[PDB]
């Protein structure tokens, strides 16, 4: 129904809005299939959403490339930088653990933060995966950079119900490269844009709007 | 006089604009003293600037906190995570190393991304430093988070002339806690907002428009 529409929207390279849940973060993210990302998508995200621009990757891709969770990197590096051990995220409110990963940048980009640079870098990642050029990964990108990556949990929505898993799930259902770029919608009252408020944005912009349970049930 | 003008502005908790040299980044960053940060500050930055919201710390503050360069952490972790080996920052886009450090969220924040959460996270960090409670760092903050920290170079603008050093140097002259929060301004053409547009922006909002080399020369 609504999910199907969302799937069709993704194949056409459009942006969809996704609400997680009232009991979890209670935030709405703008979503786009990374293989169709454009400079215009980013400009719209920094302007109309305002959160962090992140690109979520399916666990299968992360494994083929050896991409780890950021916490695993810090935990290991604490042997030399002790303070990192003190910063461990053992108390995250809305969930057990975060999906944060490393941050990259295309060695070809200048500063890497402009809309053109980020869309370039993101489209390149999605393209290298779709073409199976895994051996060219380390060659095409560097790190750190300005493009933040997220790693979706093994089993997707079965073991974790975050925007990271949900959006990747939708891309899999659409038979696309399981890679998505998401950004949270912030409000003018210093908090996250309300559910009713993001919903309006969706209808007023002809975009499809979904909630966590809808996607999870379809999966 | 132009620099001292920006100084009086920083102490008043105002946002100042800085345009660096054209032979490096050729961009304009929004700048404000982190100890005087507010949700509105973040909101303005994400809407009219759009870049990455970063907090730059004086090298002395970094050493007392144990905060290293993100490149050092990845260089070390590459012993276990091979993917990081092929991403060695040997082709540094600008100077020698990236000023990028770790990302953090104060533990008493919820999602960390909202304007209130990020402003709280930056203000509490300024408070912790000003009160000299360095050993409380891990007690109050967690990593990774939604705010990106930058580590200024030893000797600041004397050894490195990046946005990170110029803005921190200012905080020193202003006799404030040497911690600043910066956001690069993005243009609608997909690139960084040009100097002509930043000047016009500074005028309409009546904000100081300081030059990069002016700050260094005065230092
Ligand atoms: Ca989140
Ligand atoms: Zn989320
Ligand atoms: Zn206090």
From Swiss-Prot, chains A, B:
Catalytic function, reaction form: D-ribulose 5-phosphate = (2S)-2-hydroxy-3-oxobutyl phosphate + formate + H(+)
InterPro entries: DHBP_synth_RibB-like_a/b_dom (IPR017945), DHBP_synthase_RibB (IPR000422)
Organism: Methanocaldococcus jannaschii (strain ATCC 43067 / DSM 2661 / JAL-1 / JCM 10045 / NBRC 100440) (Methanococcus jannaschii)
Binding positions (Mg(2+) 2): 25, 163
Effect of residue 146 to S: Reduces activity 10-fold
UniProt keyword annotations, A-Z: Lyase, Magnesium, Manganese, Metal-binding, Riboflavin biosynthesis
Name of this chain's protein: 3,4-dihydroxy-2-butanone 4-phosphate synthase
GO molecular function, one term: magnesium ion binding
Cofactor(s) needed by this chain: Mg(2+); Mn(2+)
